[PDB]
């Protein structure tokens, strides 16, 4: 345990089951697949051979001629097509237990600790919209690829984070796996961690 400090480097040791959680890929490799699946529009194109704009008009008059054995131009094997298992609205959202959910964000937490890349720095909130102040905030502390994740409310901070695509708006209450994982440095206030405990474990 070690989540650093503002002016020092220290432990805070608010849990050790969230930051002494042992790591198995397998659980995380399910959750992360869900966050991806559950941001995924299921509402697809295509149309079926019932939903063809054709008709049943028959391009032969039974045997007597041998141009084709097909009775239809609403076949899916036609130039018109139809496709037998045509795409439409489909669900792609998985359940995933609340204890896997927490479970992930506890192993993933207690993996950043073992890979010392989790940073607790305070008062990183910005006084005014102007992203040259949110540049220097990361820069001077030699950070990039950040989340800037806090439960705390500064709106100039949400707004300014939108420019530069190596950082997006993140909140403690909004927390998920994939966002931690990609944006390697992980930035949080002393207050943020205290709340992150109750929200998760």
């Amino acid at each position: 345990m070690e989540l650093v400090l503002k002016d020092a480097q220290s432990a805070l040791t608010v849990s050790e089951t969230t930051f002494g959680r042992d790591f198995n890929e397998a659980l995380v490799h399910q959750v992360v697949v869900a966050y991806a699946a559950g941001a995924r529009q299921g509402t697809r194109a295509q149309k079926t051979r019932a939903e063809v704009t054709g008709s049943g008009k028959k391009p032969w008059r039974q045997k007597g001629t041998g141009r084709a054995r097909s009775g239809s131009i609403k076949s899916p094997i036609w130039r018109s097509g139809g496709v037998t298992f045509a795409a439409r609205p489909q669900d792609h959202s998985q359940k995933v237990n609340k204890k896997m959910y927490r479970g992930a964000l506890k192993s993933i937490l207690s993996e950043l600790v073992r890979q010392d890349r989790l940073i607790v720095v305070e008062k990183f909130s910005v006084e005014a919209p102007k992203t040259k102040l949110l540049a220097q905030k990361l820069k001077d502390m030699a950070l990039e690829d950040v989340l800037i994740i806090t439960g705390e409310l500064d709106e100039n901070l949400f707004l300014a984070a939108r420019n530069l695509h190596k950082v997006d708006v993140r909140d403690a209450t909004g927390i998920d796996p994939v966002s931690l994982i990609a944006f390697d440095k992980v930035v949080m206030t002393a207050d943020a961690v205290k709340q992150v405990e109750e929200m998760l474990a």
């Binding site: 391009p59 032969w60 008059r61 007597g64 001629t65 141009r67």
Partner: peptide, 20 residues
């Protein structure tokens, strides 16, 4: 450069079954 081409489907049968 016009094009017009149909398909045909009419019988060529005229001959009658053997040994009923």
């Amino acid at each position: 450069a016009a094009a017009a081409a149909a398909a045909a489907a009419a019988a060529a049968a005229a001959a009658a079954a053997a040994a009923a």
